[PDB]
Amino acid sequence: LHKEPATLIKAIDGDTVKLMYKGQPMTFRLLLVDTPEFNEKYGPEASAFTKKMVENAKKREVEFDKGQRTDKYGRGLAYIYADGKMVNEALVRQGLAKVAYVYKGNNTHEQLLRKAEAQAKKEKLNIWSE
Numbered sequence: 849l850h851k852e853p854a855t856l857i858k859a860i861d862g863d864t865v866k867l868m869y870k871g872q873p874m875t876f877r878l879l880l881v882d883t884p885e886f887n888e889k890y891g892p893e894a895s896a897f898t899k900k901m902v903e904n905a906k907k908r909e910v911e912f913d914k915g916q917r918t919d920k921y922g923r924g925l926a927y928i929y930a931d932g933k934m935v936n937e938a939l940v941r942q943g944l945a946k947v948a949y950v951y952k953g954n955n956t957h958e959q960l961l962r963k964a965e966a967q968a969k970k971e972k973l974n975i976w977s978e
């Protein structure tokens with residue numbers, strides 16, 4: 849896998865962001881995670897985390913996995929990095945997303961995120977507090 853420049857249009861919520869990819873405004877969905885919907889518990893916190901992480905970054909990058917690059921909804925499927933730190937991983941590590949939607953075609957960072965989730969669970973953070 850290889851990283852490439854991400855041109856940010858706007859943050860959307862915990863696990864989606866709007867990028868301009870090859871000159872097309874495009875929703876990107878974070879691979880291997882699930883943040884709460886904005887209206888659900890930890891939803892506003894997940895949204896705020898992803899938003900500030902991507903916005904405050906000097907270097908924003910997108911990394912496709914080996915399989916499907918878009919889902920059935922036309923959304924890009926990628927890992928997103930902010931100054932070298934993976935947003936997908938940071939959400940899981942902080943208890944603001946569950947590892948989810950694990951498809952064998954696009955699962956390169958599964959073990960990494962499962963490691964992060966086990967630590968969030970141990971620490972009883974956010975989603976794992978109840």
Ligand SMILES: Cc1cn([C@H]2C[C@H](OP(=O)(O)O)[C@@H](COP(=O)(O)O)O2)c(=O)[nH]c1=O
Pocket residue numbers: 877878879880881882919920925948949951954
């Ligand atoms: C993360 C991810 C979601 N999806 C699909 C599965 C869900 O479809 P269904 O709607 O048919 O269940 C939906 C969940 O996205 P959201 O969590 O953004 O709603 O997006 C993929 O197809 N591939 C993926 O990698």
Ligand SMILES: [Ca+2]
Pocket residue numbers: 863882883884885
């Ligand atoms: Ca979601």
